[PDB]
Amino acid sequence: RVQPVIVEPLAAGQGKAIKAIAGYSISKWEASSDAITAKATNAMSITLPHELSSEKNKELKVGRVLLWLGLLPSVAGRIKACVAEKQAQAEAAFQVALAVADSSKEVVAAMYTDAFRGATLGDLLNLQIYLYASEAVPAKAVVVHLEVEHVRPTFDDFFTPVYR
Amino acid sequence: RVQPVIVEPLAAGQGKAIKAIAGYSISKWEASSDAITAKATNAMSITLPHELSSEKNKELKVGRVLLWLGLLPSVAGRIKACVAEKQAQAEAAFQVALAVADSSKEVVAAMYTDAFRGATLGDLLNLQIYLYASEAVPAKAVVVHLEVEHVRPTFDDFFTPVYR
Amino acid sequence: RVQPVIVEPLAAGQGKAIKAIAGYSISKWEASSDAITAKATNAMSITLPHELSSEKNKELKVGRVLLWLGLLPSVAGRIKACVAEKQAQAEAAFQVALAVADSSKEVVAAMYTDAFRGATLGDLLNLQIYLYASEAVPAKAVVVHLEVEHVRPTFDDFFTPVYR
Amino acid sequence: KAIKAIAGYSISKWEASSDAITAKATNAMSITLPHELSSEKNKELKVGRVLLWLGLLPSVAGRIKACVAEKQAQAEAAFQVALAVADSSKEVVAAMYTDAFRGATLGDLLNLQIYLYASEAVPAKAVVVHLEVEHVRPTFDDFFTPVYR
Amino acid sequence: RVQPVIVEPLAAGQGKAIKAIAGYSISKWEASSDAITAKATNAMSITLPHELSSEKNKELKVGRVLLWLGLLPSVAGRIKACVAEKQAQAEAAFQVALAVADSSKEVVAAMYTDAFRGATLGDLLNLQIYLYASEAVPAKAVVVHLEVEHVRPTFDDFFTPVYR
Amino acid sequence: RVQPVIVEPLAAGQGKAIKAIAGYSISKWEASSDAITAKATNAMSITLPHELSSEKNKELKVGRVLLWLGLLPSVAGRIKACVAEKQAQAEAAFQVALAVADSSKEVVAAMYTDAFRGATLGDLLNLQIYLYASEAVPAKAVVVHLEVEHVRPTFDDFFTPVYR
Amino acid sequence: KAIKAIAGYSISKWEASSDAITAKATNAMSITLPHELSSEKNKELKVGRVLLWLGLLPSVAGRIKACVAEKQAQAEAAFQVALAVADSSKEVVAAMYTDAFRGATLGDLLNLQIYLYASEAVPAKAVVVHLEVEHVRPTFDDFFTPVYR
């Protein structure tokens, strides 16, 4: 018996939008990038957010690491990005990257399941974010957003003492 | 009666893991390519890692195998790749090979279920992987990540006779 | 209630790969082809494999006849093939062919269900394999593989007598 | 009533046309598989009983004898170690090895080489060897290669 | 009442395996020594294998560790070896180290139960092994086989997201 | 309660003498060696016994590999031996050897549990037996006996046919 | 389907390369054991059926025949008492003794001597004898010699 089916087209932004695995809070931050030179890779250091720079939470156990590239509309051809370990060989970073984003898929995003759980959160500093562009991109014209969950810093809920 | 249905799109790396069937164990490694001229094929001789150089483990049963090549982003055009027996004429292998990775198709991973089950690694020592470039490409601009899996050698869970 | 669904992209060569209907063994063989001339049909005789040329098995009842064309990577534009009855009109062979292969579908293969069961196996000799190419193809640059099941030649399992 | 193929096994047969032969000297020949089981998953199959029964051009004179063995040193003395000598003089030309190889892999057959011998020289292509070998049937061979090439 | 008893002697390599406690997994490797002068100690900086270079697995818990050096037979006299924290004065480490391999004693294997349980491999990156030669010895005449073990990284039993 | 015990001294050759694990027949053979030069290693090829040279039994699954060196009484100082993989570096063969024999232990023997099960028996050919001697040893003055079990060649129990 | 080894027994096989042979005269040869069962505990084992099937250099002309017997007097007449004559002329070269020796010790085989014969002389090493003998398996051979040498 051949069951029929209709495919509802999706308006943008509709969707399940995933969910954090239990007990892990999410946190998210920006990474603006330098202007690139044409068909040349770059490797921004993934500087950690200031409010998580405390030594108290650099022990945290990173989980899923969603990444989603963001574009100025004016940018033209293909643009690519991926997190990777600190290669002295920039292009080669794509070669062993677990997953890679692309502008051309009309779903520019990437997700790193099983890539980092449960590497310690302060050790993300060793990582870098690599970018590639097919044509000249003016400064700030591309911004890599990224989101990562981790065990909730429940010990951040207290007030600073004084005045107690 | 019709069934309504609504198609989520999923990010790179989001896909369900292809679990190894139980009791087996993975062995990943990668092979660099060299030179690769114009529209002409070349042979890479798949070489085993030092942890499999041991003579016990070379005669473990092979299970499923997977091959995905990693394109360097700057490389233009489509390059295809196959796993094959040492054919005399390198082109002919694409006429016989069970599968072929395609740079152009959205997924770039040839997998060989069934085609290799039960093979000795003493056969896999005597086997080649072919590259076909549609254009001239810079040396070591392409490296092929493959993994085979085999019943785990048992010395992984023991020390050694401390007396020696 | 609109049930959601994710579409796993397939890596090449993954798949159910069909199955022979019970009691029929499969057999498979090659058919290399002559160099074509541009936009001209050709009609290779489907010479039967040598190990099935025995008069004992030319009575066998052919079933499904899978066909899958194989290519040298260098070949450019569209290429087509189909089995057909012995026309003196070569192009017209496509006109009544039950099914036809094409390079452009990114799934170049063809299958002849209900096309031959249960025509007698030796009478496949009357058939021919027609080919068409949009541009010049150098010799041996295309090879039509084909697979066909049939009742198992169970009487081929014996040894030759002497020495009994 | 040919001897039954062992259950769970399946015979394969092939010729291998002879290299030209000189008198007295035992010109060698190498066994090679049909292209169909060159592939390694097939190279790992397990051998059953094996036999050869060379067929000749009717005009052939004198005698010829053919024996399997691993290649070694001088390569004319292979007969002395050879398990059985197929021959023309005997009422039955054939030679059988129902022992010899049981439990061997097909992948080891590549190392052994049939040896031919003749008294006076015989013209090439006037003699053929017809190996027939029994082996466990490959697991894949019951169905189609997947359509998604 | 006395108990009679009769002492079998046992061959090299005959001894009962020291099994890793469950769920953990071994990682063996070896470190060459260089030069090693007269009756003076030297430091070897224990370096990790490429399969542990990955940032997930470096923060796995360490369990028990084992060190047995392999004397080249031609070497004369006794050489001792230890595992120790980067002491300023190399000799002083033999004054603090929990154990020491002895060339002269019949067994040549120092093992550290308890002394290392719970260590991060990010600590073991920053740790040294000392050699003490009683005589002048030729370069690379001594290599130290050690293995540490750690809860198995889980990527050993999965492929990779084939889509990428 | 401190239980007393007497230690019976053993006359030579008394003892349990081990036992083959079930279903595996033992086989044993000689390996005579060339005259050595003083404090120089040698590496005899481990030529397999003639009666096991048949292709039928080179598939066999080696188990335990007992080795026991045998001496002419006149030989003086320390003598050593070990099986090993085919190094181009002779002395280094001791460095990774799983176990090693020595004349000085007054129990000169060695045993390779977990060293080869279940490496295929014909592939022992790749191995070599390394020897070392502290002083000049005249030819044939040392002979390495070795014993190894394997699945019984039950198909060797038949007679040769003719006369059937 | 080779004839089954009797249960509780185990075959042993060996060649014994021939001494040089002269025409008409029957040059003798002595049977000798493989070095492996020279040892006396093995010399006391009990024989089963025994057979020989000499293999020849293919170039050998004429005929040759080989027969077992106890050594005696003139030593050329050994054939007349010999139980069966292995020969080249016969369709099967082999000779069998499924009776002959059952219940004999291996230690008595040392006394008997295979006799070779030829018409015209044959060059040495051009003929080999392949004794195959069945005997009860030694009790020790299932395990390691004790480590404490």
Coordinates of C-alpha atoms in Angstrom, one line a residue, chain G residues 36-115:
Chain G
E36 CA 62.5 -36.9 15.4
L37 CA 61.7 -40.6 16.3
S38 CA 65.2 -41.9 16.6
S39 CA 64.6 -41.7 20.4
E40 CA 63.8 -45.0 22.0
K41 CA 60.5 -44.3 23.6
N42 CA 59.5 -43.7 20.0
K43 CA 61.3 -46.7 18.7
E44 CA 58.8 -48.8 20.7
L45 CA 55.7 -47.6 18.8
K46 CA 53.4 -50.0 17.0
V47 CA 53.1 -50.0 13.2
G48 CA 49.8 -49.8 11.3
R49 CA 49.5 -50.3 7.5
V50 CA 52.5 -49.1 5.5
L51 CA 52.9 -48.1 1.9
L52 CA 55.4 -46.7 -0.5
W53 CA 54.9 -44.9 -3.8
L54 CA 58.2 -43.9 -5.4
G55 CA 58.2 -40.7 -7.5
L56 CA 60.6 -40.4 -10.4
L57 CA 62.3 -37.8 -12.5
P58 CA 60.1 -37.5 -15.6
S59 CA 62.9 -38.1 -17.9
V60 CA 63.6 -41.6 -16.5
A61 CA 63.4 -44.3 -19.2
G62 CA 62.5 -48.0 -19.1
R63 CA 61.3 -49.4 -15.7
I64 CA 62.1 -49.5 -12.1
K65 CA 60.6 -51.6 -9.2
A66 CA 60.9 -51.3 -5.4
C67 CA 60.1 -53.9 -2.8
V68 CA 60.5 -54.1 1.0
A69 CA 62.0 -57.1 2.7
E70 CA 64.4 -58.2 5.4
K71 CA 68.0 -58.2 4.2
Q72 CA 69.1 -61.6 3.2
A73 CA 72.0 -63.6 1.6
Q74 CA 72.5 -62.8 -2.0
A75 CA 70.3 -59.7 -1.9
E76 CA 68.7 -59.5 -5.4
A77 CA 66.1 -62.2 -5.0
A78 CA 64.3 -60.1 -2.4
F79 CA 61.5 -59.6 -4.9
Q80 CA 60.4 -63.2 -4.9
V81 CA 59.4 -63.1 -1.2
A82 CA 58.3 -59.5 -1.3
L83 CA 54.6 -59.0 -0.7
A84 CA 53.9 -56.5 -3.4
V85 CA 55.9 -55.0 -6.2
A86 CA 55.7 -51.2 -6.6
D87 CA 56.4 -50.6 -10.3
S88 CA 56.3 -47.9 -13.0
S89 CA 54.7 -50.1 -15.7
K90 CA 51.5 -50.5 -13.7
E91 CA 48.8 -47.9 -14.0
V92 CA 49.5 -47.2 -10.4
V93 CA 53.1 -47.0 -9.2
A94 CA 52.2 -47.4 -5.6
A95 CA 52.5 -50.5 -3.4
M96 CA 50.5 -51.2 -0.3
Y97 CA 50.9 -53.3 2.8
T98 CA 47.7 -53.2 4.8
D99 CA 48.7 -56.5 6.3
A100 CA 52.4 -57.2 6.2
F101 CA 53.3 -55.3 9.3
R102 CA 50.2 -54.7 11.6
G103 CA 51.3 -55.3 15.1
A104 CA 55.0 -54.7 14.3
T105 CA 57.1 -52.3 16.3
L106 CA 58.8 -49.3 14.6
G107 CA 62.0 -50.6 16.1
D108 CA 61.9 -53.6 13.8
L109 CA 61.6 -51.5 10.6
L110 CA 65.2 -50.7 11.1
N111 CA 66.1 -54.3 10.1
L112 CA 64.2 -54.3 6.7
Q113 CA 65.7 -52.6 3.6
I114 CA 63.9 -51.3 0.5
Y115 CA 65.3 -52.8 -2.7

